[PDB]
């Protein structure tokens, strides 16, 4: 009996298949989150600066109140 | 046999133009390229230290 190297292909490994595809981001939907984070960013920040004004006037009031200084 | 490397204008009108502009305005594909190495970091490396482990050979 002769024994040589046997042939096997099975699945053929798929000859040239695309793996690159669009994922997560679509296009217009990313701008809704992108610019949406900006509008949420300013509104949250400016409310803190209005709360800073409560401290600001109260800080300068200490100088006016102190005349024996 | 012919396979063609040129895409021949991927952007046409409105919807196809904006997403091709979005990747150049910010990044997106660079963040997508960042994710390629990210998963590559977690998977176990095939490394052989010579004074203890030995590499594959043949008869």
mmCIF file of N, CA and C in Angstrom:
data_model
loop_
_atom_site.group_PDB
_atom_site.id
_atom_site.type_symbol
_atom_site.label_atom_id
_atom_site.label_comp_id
_atom_site.label_asym_id
_atom_site.label_seq_id
_atom_site.Cartn_x
_atom_site.Cartn_y
_atom_site.Cartn_z
ATOM 1 N N UNK A 1 0.852 -1.226 0.000
ATOM 2 C CA UNK A 1 0.000 0.000 0.000
ATOM 3 C C UNK A 1 0.858 1.235 0.000
ATOM 4 N N UNK A 2 0.435 2.231 -0.777
ATOM 5 C CA UNK A 2 1.145 3.508 -0.892
ATOM 6 C C UNK A 2 0.455 4.560 -0.069
ATOM 7 N N UNK A 3 1.240 5.256 0.752
ATOM 8 C CA UNK A 3 0.738 6.326 1.616
ATOM 9 C C UNK A 3 1.436 7.612 1.275
ATOM 10 N N UNK A 4 0.641 8.602 0.872
ATOM 11 C CA UNK A 4 1.136 9.929 0.498
ATOM 12 C C UNK A 4 0.339 10.993 1.214
ATOM 13 N N UNK A 5 0.635 12.258 0.910
ATOM 14 C CA UNK A 5 -0.066 13.406 1.495
ATOM 15 C C UNK A 5 -1.452 13.521 0.914
ATOM 16 N N UNK A 6 -2.446 13.549 1.800
ATOM 17 C CA UNK A 6 -3.863 13.568 1.421
ATOM 18 C C UNK A 6 -4.378 14.972 1.251
ATOM 19 N N UNK A 7 -5.372 15.118 0.376
ATOM 20 C CA UNK A 7 -5.994 16.410 0.080
ATOM 21 C C UNK A 7 -7.174 16.657 0.982
ATOM 22 N N UNK A 8 -7.264 17.889 1.487
ATOM 23 C CA UNK A 8 -8.366 18.330 2.351
ATOM 24 C C UNK A 8 -8.591 19.808 2.174
ATOM 25 N N UNK A 9 -9.848 20.178 1.920
ATOM 26 C CA UNK A 9 -10.241 21.577 1.716
ATOM 27 C C UNK A 9 -11.336 21.991 2.665
ATOM 28 N N UNK A 10 -12.346 21.125 2.817
ATOM 29 C CA UNK A 10 -13.488 21.290 3.745
ATOM 30 C C UNK A 10 -14.305 22.546 3.515
ATOM 31 N N UNK A 11 -13.828 23.682 4.032
ATOM 32 C CA UNK A 11 -14.557 24.956 3.979
ATOM 33 C C UNK A 11 -13.990 25.926 2.972
ATOM 34 N N UNK A 12 -12.789 25.620 2.467
ATOM 35 C CA UNK A 12 -12.043 26.435 1.473
ATOM 36 C C UNK A 12 -11.602 27.796 1.986
ATOM 37 N N UNK A 13 -11.731 28.008 3.301
ATOM 38 C CA UNK A 13 -11.291 29.227 4.025
ATOM 39 C C UNK A 13 -11.936 30.535 3.599
ATOM 40 N N UNK A 14 -12.853 30.460 2.628
ATOM 41 C CA UNK A 14 -13.545 31.610 2.003
ATOM 42 C C UNK A 14 -12.589 32.534 1.285
ATOM 43 N N UNK A 15 -12.609 32.444 -0.044
ATOM 44 C CA UNK A 15 -11.701 33.191 -0.916
ATOM 45 C C UNK A 15 -12.151 34.621 -1.065
ATOM 46 N N UNK A 16 -11.388 35.517 -0.435
ATOM 47 C CA UNK A 16 -11.612 36.979 -0.420
ATOM 48 C C UNK A 16 -12.974 37.392 0.092
ATOM 49 N N UNK A 17 -13.032 37.656 1.397
ATOM 50 C CA UNK A 17 -14.249 38.113 2.069
ATOM 51 C C UNK A 17 -13.981 39.416 2.768
ATOM 52 N N UNK A 18 -14.937 40.340 2.657
ATOM 53 C CA UNK A 18 -14.835 41.666 3.270
ATOM 54 C C UNK A 18 -15.166 41.594 4.736
ATOM 55 N N UNK A 19 -14.305 42.205 5.548
ATOM 56 C CA UNK A 19 -14.477 42.260 7.001
ATOM 57 C C UNK A 19 -14.794 43.658 7.461
ATOM 58 N N UNK A 20 -14.352 44.650 6.685
ATOM 59 C CA UNK A 20 -14.571 46.066 6.990
ATOM 60 C C UNK A 20 -15.999 46.444 6.701
ATOM 61 N N UNK A 21 -16.679 46.938 7.736
ATOM 62 C CA UNK A 21 -18.080 47.361 7.660
ATOM 63 C C UNK A 21 -18.329 48.480 8.634
ATOM 64 N N UNK A 22 -19.369 49.272 8.363
ATOM 65 C CA UNK A 22 -19.755 50.404 9.214
ATOM 66 C C UNK A 22 -20.340 49.910 10.511
ATOM 67 N N UNK A 23 -19.787 50.409 11.617
ATOM 68 C CA UNK A 23 -20.190 50.001 12.966
ATOM 69 C C UNK A 23 -20.327 51.192 13.876
ATOM 70 N N UNK A 24 -21.308 51.110 14.780
ATOM 71 C CA UNK A 24 -21.640 52.142 15.790
ATOM 72 C C UNK A 24 -22.135 53.436 15.179
ATOM 73 N N UNK A 25 -21.229 54.201 14.566
ATOM 74 C CA UNK A 25 -21.555 55.491 13.950
ATOM 75 C C UNK A 25 -22.236 55.300 12.621
ATOM 76 N N UNK A 26 -23.210 56.167 12.341
ATOM 77 C CA UNK A 26 -23.972 56.133 11.089
ATOM 78 C C UNK A 26 -23.683 57.342 10.236
ATOM 79 N N UNK A 27 -23.659 58.520 10.860
ATOM 80 C CA UNK A 27 -23.395 59.783 10.168
ATOM 81 C C UNK A 27 -24.095 60.957 10.823
ATOM 82 N N UNK A 28 -25.397 61.076 10.560
ATOM 83 C CA UNK A 28 -26.240 62.132 11.132
ATOM 84 C C UNK A 28 -26.508 61.938 12.626
ATOM 85 N N UNK A 29 -26.534 60.676 13.060
ATOM 86 C CA UNK A 29 -26.794 60.305 14.457
ATOM 87 C C UNK A 29 -25.671 60.708 15.418
ATOM 88 N N UNK A 30 -24.439 60.748 14.909
ATOM 89 C CA UNK A 30 -23.261 61.133 15.694
ATOM 90 C C UNK A 30 -23.227 62.634 16.001
ATOM 91 N N UNK A 31 -23.771 63.439 15.087
ATOM 92 C CA UNK A 31 -23.899 64.889 15.275
ATOM 93 C C UNK A 31 -24.947 65.263 16.326
ATOM 94 N N UNK A 32 -25.985 64.433 16.447
ATOM 95 C CA UNK A 32 -27.036 64.601 17.458
ATOM 96 C C UNK A 32 -26.522 64.373 18.883
ATOM 97 N N UNK A 33 -25.534 63.487 19.016
ATOM 98 C CA UNK A 33 -24.854 63.220 20.289
ATOM 99 C C UNK A 33 -23.689 64.204 20.476
ATOM 100 N N UNK A 34 -23.002 64.523 19.377
ATOM 101 C CA UNK A 34 -21.842 65.423 19.372
ATOM 102 C C UNK A 34 -22.157 66.859 19.752
ATOM 103 N N UNK A 35 -23.074 67.476 19.007
ATOM 104 C CA UNK A 35 -23.544 68.844 19.290
ATOM 105 C C UNK A 35 -24.479 68.847 20.512
ATOM 106 N N UNK A 36 -25.161 67.721 20.735
ATOM 107 C CA UNK A 36 -26.017 67.513 21.910
ATOM 108 C C UNK A 36 -25.276 67.547 23.237
ATOM 109 N N UNK A 37 -24.035 67.057 23.233
ATOM 110 C CA UNK A 37 -23.145 67.117 24.397
ATOM 111 C C UNK A 37 -22.633 68.535 24.660
ATOM 112 N N UNK A 38 -22.485 69.316 23.587
ATOM 113 C CA UNK A 38 -22.071 70.720 23.667
ATOM 114 C C UNK A 38 -23.144 71.602 24.311
ATOM 115 N N UNK A 39 -24.391 71.449 23.854
ATOM 116 C CA UNK A 39 -25.546 72.185 24.390
ATOM 117 C C UNK A 39 -25.851 71.828 25.848
ATOM 118 N N UNK A 40 -25.636 70.559 26.200
ATOM 119 C CA UNK A 40 -25.709 70.085 27.584
ATOM 120 C C UNK A 40 -24.516 70.591 28.400
ATOM 121 N N UNK A 41 -23.380 70.774 27.723
ATOM 122 C CA UNK A 41 -22.140 71.251 28.337
ATOM 123 C C UNK A 41 -22.187 72.688 28.825
ATOM 124 N N UNK A 42 -22.710 73.585 27.986
ATOM 125 C CA UNK A 42 -22.819 75.011 28.320
ATOM 126 C C UNK A 42 -23.871 75.292 29.394
ATOM 127 N N UNK A 43 -25.019 74.619 29.287
ATOM 128 C CA UNK A 43 -26.147 74.781 30.214
ATOM 129 C C UNK A 43 -25.813 74.343 31.645
ATOM 130 N N UNK A 44 -25.021 73.279 31.767
ATOM 131 C CA UNK A 44 -24.557 72.777 33.063
ATOM 132 C C UNK A 44 -23.461 73.655 33.672
ATOM 133 N N UNK A 45 -22.613 74.222 32.811
ATOM 134 C CA UNK A 45 -21.478 75.045 33.237
ATOM 135 C C UNK A 45 -21.894 76.439 33.708
ATOM 136 N N UNK A 46 -22.808 77.069 32.967
ATOM 137 C CA UNK A 46 -23.247 78.445 33.238
ATOM 138 C C UNK A 46 -24.114 78.587 34.492
ATOM 139 N N UNK A 47 -24.798 77.504 34.868
ATOM 140 C CA UNK A 47 -25.575 77.441 36.112
ATOM 141 C C UNK A 47 -24.679 77.448 37.353
ATOM 142 N N UNK A 48 -23.488 76.861 37.222
ATOM 143 C CA UNK A 48 -22.466 76.873 38.273
ATOM 144 C C UNK A 48 -21.846 78.263 38.452
ATOM 145 N N UNK A 49 -21.687 78.988 37.343
ATOM 146 C CA UNK A 49 -21.175 80.363 37.356
ATOM 147 C C UNK A 49 -22.168 81.366 37.953
ATOM 148 N N UNK A 50 -23.461 81.059 37.835
ATOM 149 C CA UNK A 50 -24.526 81.820 38.501
ATOM 150 C C UNK A 50 -24.544 81.544 40.005
ATOM 151 N N UNK A 51 -24.170 80.318 40.380
ATOM 152 C CA UNK A 51 -23.991 79.923 41.780
ATOM 153 C C UNK A 51 -22.693 80.503 42.352
ATOM 154 N N UNK A 52 -21.715 80.736 41.473
ATOM 155 C CA UNK A 52 -20.463 81.418 41.816
ATOM 156 C C UNK A 52 -20.705 82.897 42.151
ATOM 157 N N UNK A 53 -21.674 83.508 41.464
ATOM 158 C CA UNK A 53 -22.095 84.896 41.713
ATOM 159 C C UNK A 53 -22.644 85.117 43.125
ATOM 160 N N UNK A 54 -23.308 84.092 43.667
ATOM 161 C CA UNK A 54 -23.812 84.086 45.049
ATOM 162 C C UNK A 54 -22.660 84.183 46.051
ATOM 163 N N UNK A 55 -21.557 83.505 45.730
ATOM 164 C CA UNK A 55 -20.329 83.532 46.524
ATOM 165 C C UNK A 55 -19.532 84.814 46.283
ATOM 166 N N UNK A 56 -19.516 85.272 45.026
ATOM 167 C CA UNK A 56 -18.727 86.430 44.582
ATOM 168 C C UNK A 56 -19.099 87.725 45.316
ATOM 169 N N UNK A 57 -20.386 88.080 45.281
ATOM 170 C CA UNK A 57 -20.912 89.289 45.940
ATOM 171 C C UNK A 57 -20.717 89.209 47.462
ATOM 172 N N UNK A 58 -20.912 88.011 48.016
ATOM 173 C CA UNK A 58 -20.726 87.739 49.446
ATOM 174 C C UNK A 58 -19.262 87.858 49.896
ATOM 175 N N UNK A 59 -18.330 87.547 48.991
ATOM 176 C CA UNK A 59 -16.890 87.682 49.247
ATOM 177 C C UNK A 59 -16.439 89.143 49.315
ATOM 178 N N UNK A 60 -16.914 89.956 48.368
ATOM 179 C CA UNK A 60 -16.601 91.388 48.321
ATOM 180 C C UNK A 60 -17.328 92.201 49.397
ATOM 181 N N UNK A 61 -18.443 91.660 49.896
ATOM 182 C CA UNK A 61 -19.220 92.259 50.992
ATOM 183 C C UNK A 61 -18.438 92.275 52.310
ATOM 184 N N UNK A 62 -17.566 91.280 52.489
ATOM 185 C CA UNK A 62 -16.689 91.168 53.661
ATOM 186 C C UNK A 62 -15.705 92.336 53.792
ATOM 187 N N UNK A 63 -15.233 92.850 52.653
ATOM 188 C CA UNK A 63 -14.339 94.012 52.610
ATOM 189 C C UNK A 63 -15.058 95.307 53.006
ATOM 190 N N UNK A 64 -16.299 95.460 52.538
ATOM 191 C CA UNK A 64 -17.138 96.632 52.833
ATOM 192 C C UNK A 64 -17.561 96.634 54.310
ATOM 193 N N UNK A 65 -17.891 95.449 54.829
ATOM 194 C CA UNK A 65 -18.279 95.263 56.232
ATOM 195 C C UNK A 65 -17.130 95.530 57.207
ATOM 196 N N UNK A 66 -15.907 95.191 56.794
ATOM 197 C CA UNK A 66 -14.713 95.415 57.609
ATOM 198 C C UNK A 66 -14.109 96.803 57.381
ATOM 199 N N UNK A 67 -14.411 97.704 58.314
ATOM 200 C CA UNK A 67 -13.855 99.059 58.346
ATOM 201 C C UNK A 67 -12.774 99.257 59.430
ATOM 202 N N UNK A 68 -12.847 98.516 60.573
ATOM 203 C CA UNK A 68 -11.701 98.499 61.503
ATOM 204 C C UNK A 68 -10.408 97.912 60.923
ATOM 205 N N UNK A 69 -10.528 97.147 59.834
ATOM 206 C CA UNK A 69 -9.383 96.632 59.076
ATOM 207 C C UNK A 69 -8.591 97.770 58.423
ATOM 208 N N UNK B 1 -7.397 39.744 -15.332
ATOM 209 C CA UNK B 1 -8.637 39.329 -14.607
ATOM 210 C C UNK B 1 -9.464 40.522 -14.119
ATOM 211 N N UNK B 2 -8.772 41.600 -13.732
ATOM 212 C CA UNK B 2 -9.354 42.867 -13.231
ATOM 213 C C UNK B 2 -10.092 42.762 -11.889
ATOM 214 N N UNK B 3 -9.743 43.661 -10.970
ATOM 215 C CA UNK B 3 -10.356 43.721 -9.639
ATOM 216 C C UNK B 3 -10.768 45.139 -9.234
ATOM 217 N N UNK B 4 -10.026 46.130 -9.743
ATOM 218 C CA UNK B 4 -10.232 47.575 -9.499
ATOM 219 C C UNK B 4 -9.978 48.033 -8.057
ATOM 220 N N UNK B 5 -9.046 48.976 -7.916
ATOM 221 C CA UNK B 5 -8.678 49.556 -6.621
ATOM 222 C C UNK B 5 -9.385 50.887 -6.343
ATOM 223 N N UNK B 6 -9.740 51.602 -7.412
ATOM 224 C CA UNK B 6 -10.420 52.897 -7.323
ATOM 225 C C UNK B 6 -11.892 52.750 -6.941
ATOM 226 N N UNK B 7 -12.327 53.581 -5.993
ATOM 227 C CA UNK B 7 -13.706 53.579 -5.494
ATOM 228 C C UNK B 7 -14.688 54.283 -6.435
ATOM 229 N N UNK B 8 -14.172 55.243 -7.210
ATOM 230 C CA UNK B 8 -14.939 56.072 -8.164
ATOM 231 C C UNK B 8 -16.094 56.853 -7.511
ATOM 232 N N UNK B 9 -15.720 57.887 -6.752
ATOM 233 C CA UNK B 9 -16.639 58.806 -6.046
ATOM 234 C C UNK B 9 -17.661 58.120 -5.111
ATOM 235 N N UNK B 10 -17.281 57.902 -3.829
ATOM 236 C CA UNK B 10 -18.207 57.312 -2.848
ATOM 237 C C UNK B 10 -19.344 58.250 -2.421
ATOM 238 N N UNK B 11 -19.094 59.559 -2.469
ATOM 239 C CA UNK B 11 -20.088 60.575 -2.119
ATOM 240 C C UNK B 11 -20.818 61.091 -3.356
ATOM 241 N N UNK B 12 -22.139 61.217 -3.238
ATOM 242 C CA UNK B 12 -22.990 61.691 -4.331
ATOM 243 C C UNK B 12 -23.773 62.949 -3.950
ATOM 244 N N UNK B 13 -24.712 62.809 -3.009
ATOM 245 C CA UNK B 13 -25.581 63.914 -2.582
ATOM 246 C C UNK B 13 -26.081 63.763 -1.145
ATOM 247 N N UNK B 14 -26.001 64.867 -0.399
ATOM 248 C CA UNK B 14 -26.543 65.023 0.968
ATOM 249 C C UNK B 14 -26.077 63.994 2.012
ATOM 250 N N UNK B 15 -26.676 62.801 1.988
ATOM 251 C CA UNK B 15 -26.430 61.752 2.986
ATOM 252 C C UNK B 15 -25.051 61.099 2.862
ATOM 253 N N UNK B 16 -24.610 60.881 1.623
ATOM 254 C CA UNK B 16 -23.320 60.245 1.330
ATOM 255 C C UNK B 16 -22.124 61.200 1.439
ATOM 256 N N UNK B 17 -22.403 62.504 1.432
ATOM 257 C CA UNK B 17 -21.371 63.547 1.514
ATOM 258 C C UNK B 17 -21.011 63.859 2.974
ATOM 259 N N UNK B 18 -22.031 63.922 3.834
ATOM 260 C CA UNK B 18 -21.883 64.323 5.245
ATOM 261 C C UNK B 18 -21.031 63.379 6.102
ATOM 262 N N UNK B 19 -21.214 62.069 5.924
ATOM 263 C CA UNK B 19 -20.450 61.056 6.668
ATOM 264 C C UNK B 19 -18.994 60.941 6.196
ATOM 265 N N UNK B 20 -18.762 61.262 4.922
ATOM 266 C CA UNK B 20 -17.417 61.345 4.344
ATOM 267 C C UNK B 20 -16.711 62.632 4.788
ATOM 268 N N UNK B 21 -17.506 63.636 5.159
ATOM 269 C CA UNK B 21 -17.004 64.896 5.704
ATOM 270 C C UNK B 21 -16.789 64.828 7.218
ATOM 271 N N UNK B 22 -17.600 64.013 7.896
ATOM 272 C CA UNK B 22 -17.532 63.824 9.352
ATOM 273 C C UNK B 22 -16.240 63.146 9.811
ATOM 274 N N UNK B 23 -15.744 62.211 8.998
ATOM 275 C CA UNK B 23 -14.485 61.503 9.267
ATOM 276 C C UNK B 23 -13.240 62.380 9.074
ATOM 277 N N UNK B 24 -13.398 63.468 8.320
ATOM 278 C CA UNK B 24 -12.323 64.438 8.073
ATOM 279 C C UNK B 24 -12.412 65.684 8.967
ATOM 280 N N UNK B 25 -13.623 66.001 9.434
ATOM 281 C CA UNK B 25 -13.861 67.137 10.338
ATOM 282 C C UNK B 25 -13.322 66.838 11.740
ATOM 283 N N UNK B 26 -13.819 65.762 12.350
ATOM 284 C CA UNK B 26 -13.267 65.242 13.603
ATOM 285 C C UNK B 26 -12.255 64.127 13.289
ATOM 286 N N UNK B 27 -12.530 62.888 13.705
ATOM 287 C CA UNK B 27 -11.675 61.744 13.367
ATOM 288 C C UNK B 27 -12.467 60.491 12.971
ATOM 289 N N UNK B 28 -13.223 59.935 13.925
ATOM 290 C CA UNK B 28 -14.034 58.698 13.774
ATOM 291 C C UNK B 28 -13.244 57.432 13.390
ATOM 292 N N UNK B 29 -12.632 57.431 12.201
ATOM 293 C CA UNK B 29 -11.867 56.282 11.697
ATOM 294 C C UNK B 29 -10.529 56.080 12.426
ATOM 295 N N UNK B 30 -10.011 57.159 13.017
ATOM 296 C CA UNK B 30 -8.832 57.106 13.881
ATOM 297 C C UNK B 30 -9.196 56.474 15.227
ATOM 298 N N UNK B 31 -10.390 56.799 15.727
ATOM 299 C CA UNK B 31 -10.953 56.187 16.942
ATOM 300 C C UNK B 31 -11.324 54.720 16.665
ATOM 301 N N UNK B 32 -11.755 54.443 15.432
ATOM 302 C CA UNK B 32 -12.005 53.078 14.957
ATOM 303 C C UNK B 32 -10.695 52.302 14.775
ATOM 304 N N UNK B 33 -9.645 53.010 14.355
ATOM 305 C CA UNK B 33 -8.291 52.457 14.253
ATOM 306 C C UNK B 33 -7.641 52.233 15.609
ATOM 307 N N UNK B 34 -8.051 53.038 16.591
ATOM 308 C CA UNK B 34 -7.632 52.903 17.990
ATOM 309 C C UNK B 34 -8.182 51.616 18.610
ATOM 310 N N UNK B 35 -9.396 51.241 18.200
ATOM 311 C CA UNK B 35 -10.071 50.031 18.677
ATOM 312 C C UNK B 35 -9.483 48.722 18.176
ATOM 313 N N UNK B 36 -8.738 48.788 17.070
ATOM 314 C CA UNK B 36 -8.069 47.620 16.483
ATOM 315 C C UNK B 36 -6.930 47.105 17.362
ATOM 316 N N UNK B 37 -6.124 48.035 17.874
ATOM 317 C CA UNK B 37 -5.033 47.729 18.805
ATOM 318 C C UNK B 37 -5.529 47.464 20.228
ATOM 319 N N UNK B 38 -6.707 48.004 20.549
ATOM 320 C CA UNK B 38 -7.328 47.882 21.873
ATOM 321 C C UNK B 38 -7.648 46.429 22.232
ATOM 322 N N UNK B 39 -8.309 45.723 21.313
ATOM 323 C CA UNK B 39 -8.620 44.297 21.465
ATOM 324 C C UNK B 39 -7.389 43.411 21.272
ATOM 325 N N UNK B 40 -6.433 43.909 20.489
ATOM 326 C CA UNK B 40 -5.156 43.241 20.229
ATOM 327 C C UNK B 40 -4.264 43.204 21.474
ATOM 328 N N UNK B 41 -4.484 44.159 22.380
ATOM 329 C CA UNK B 41 -3.773 44.249 23.656
ATOM 330 C C UNK B 41 -4.205 43.158 24.641
ATOM 331 N N UNK B 42 -5.502 42.844 24.651
ATOM 332 C CA UNK B 42 -6.082 41.900 25.614
ATOM 333 C C UNK B 42 -5.742 40.434 25.345
ATOM 334 N N UNK B 43 -5.741 40.044 24.068
ATOM 335 C CA UNK B 43 -5.432 38.666 23.651
ATOM 336 C C UNK B 43 -3.987 38.267 23.957
ATOM 337 N N UNK B 44 -3.809 37.011 24.367
ATOM 338 C CA UNK B 44 -2.519 36.490 24.843
ATOM 339 C C UNK B 44 -1.417 36.477 23.770
ATOM 340 N N UNK B 45 -0.226 37.032 24.100
ATOM 341 C CA UNK B 45 0.886 37.055 23.146
ATOM 342 C C UNK B 45 1.608 35.711 23.040
ATOM 343 N N UNK B 46 2.040 35.374 21.825
ATOM 344 C CA UNK B 46 2.826 34.168 21.576
ATOM 345 C C UNK B 46 4.316 34.495 21.668
ATOM 346 N N UNK B 47 4.862 34.326 22.871
ATOM 347 C CA UNK B 47 6.260 34.651 23.169
ATOM 348 C C UNK B 47 6.975 33.477 23.832
ATOM 349 N N UNK B 48 8.211 33.238 23.399
ATOM 350 C CA UNK B 48 9.039 32.147 23.914
ATOM 351 C C UNK B 48 10.351 32.714 24.465
ATOM 352 N N UNK B 49 10.552 32.537 25.771
ATOM 353 C CA UNK B 49 11.812 32.883 26.432
ATOM 354 C C UNK B 49 12.782 31.712 26.295
ATOM 355 N N UNK B 50 13.921 31.975 25.656
ATOM 356 C CA UNK B 50 14.844 30.922 25.205
ATOM 357 C C UNK B 50 15.534 30.037 26.265
ATOM 358 N N UNK B 51 16.008 30.618 27.399
ATOM 359 C CA UNK B 51 16.699 29.766 28.387
ATOM 360 C C UNK B 51 15.818 28.733 29.110
ATOM 361 N N UNK B 52 14.500 28.819 28.921
ATOM 362 C CA UNK B 52 13.549 27.906 29.562
ATOM 363 C C UNK B 52 12.614 27.228 28.559
ATOM 364 N N UNK B 53 11.934 28.030 27.740
ATOM 365 C CA UNK B 53 11.075 27.523 26.665
ATOM 366 C C UNK B 53 11.848 27.412 25.348
ATOM 367 N N UNK B 54 11.394 26.516 24.472
ATOM 368 C CA UNK B 54 12.006 26.321 23.153
ATOM 369 C C UNK B 54 10.983 26.411 22.025
ATOM 370 N N UNK B 55 11.420 26.957 20.890
ATOM 371 C CA UNK B 55 10.569 27.133 19.711
ATOM 372 C C UNK B 55 10.333 25.859 18.912
ATOM 373 N N UNK B 56 9.324 25.871 18.007
ATOM 374 C CA UNK B 56 8.996 24.707 17.170
ATOM 375 C C UNK B 56 10.077 24.365 16.144
ATOM 376 N N UNK B 57 10.159 23.083 15.793
ATOM 377 C CA UNK B 57 11.147 22.571 14.842
ATOM 378 C C UNK B 57 10.570 21.514 13.892
ATOM 379 N N UNK B 58 11.450 20.652 13.378
ATOM 380 C CA UNK B 58 11.102 19.607 12.416
ATOM 381 C C UNK B 58 12.004 18.372 12.585
ATOM 382 N N UNK B 59 11.563 17.192 12.076
ATOM 383 C CA UNK B 59 12.438 16.008 12.040
ATOM 384 C C UNK B 59 13.687 16.183 11.169
#
